[PDB]
Chain A
Amino acid sequence: GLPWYRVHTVLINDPGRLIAAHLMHTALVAGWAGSMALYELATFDPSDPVL
Chain B
Amino acid sequence: QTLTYDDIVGTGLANKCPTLDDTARGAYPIDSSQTYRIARLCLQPTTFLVKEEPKNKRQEAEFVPTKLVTRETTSLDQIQGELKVNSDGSLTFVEEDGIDFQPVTVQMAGGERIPLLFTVKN
Closest beta carbon of chain B to A22's beta carbon, Å? 40
Kindly identify, within residues 37 to 51 of chain A, every residue whose CB is under 8 Å from any CB belonging to chain B: 46-48, 50-51
Chain A: which residue is nearest B57 at the CB level?
A: A51
B55 close to A48 (CB less than 8 A): yes
Find chain B residues with CB under 8 A from A48 CB.
Answer: 55
Answer whether residue B110 sits at the interface, using C-beta atoms and an 8 A cutoff.
yes
Kindly identify, within residues 50 to 78 of chain B, every residue whose CB is under 8 Å from any CB belonging to chain A: 55, 57
Q: Categorize the interface residue count of chain A.
A: under 10
A50 close to B57 (CB less than 8 A): yes
Find chain A residues with CB under 8 A from B110 CB.
Answer: 46-47
Closest beta carbon of chain B to A48's beta carbon, Å? 5
In the bound complex, how far is the Cα of B55 from the Cα of A26, in angstroms?
A: 42
Kindly identify, within residues 1 to 51 of chain A, every residue whose CB is under 8 Å from any CB belonging to chain B: 46-48, 50-51
Closest beta carbon of chain A to B84's beta carbon, Å? 48
B 89-122 binary contact with A (CB < 8 Å = 1; else 0)? 0000000000000000000001000000000000
In the bound complex, how far is the Cα of B110 from the Cα of A48, in angstroms?
A: 13
Closest beta carbon of chain B to A37's beta carbon, Å? 17
In the bound complex, how far is the Cα of B55 from the Cα of A51, in angstroms?
A: 10
Chain A: which residue is nearest B52 at the CB level?
A: A47
Closest beta carbon of chain B to A46's beta carbon, Å? 7
Top 5 A-B residue pairs of the complex, sorted by shortest distance between their CB atoms: A48-B55, A51-B57, A46-B110, A51-B55, A47-B55
A-B contact pairs, 8 of them (CB 8 A): A46-B110, A47-B55, A47-B110, A48-B55, A50-B55, A50-B57, A51-B55, A51-B57
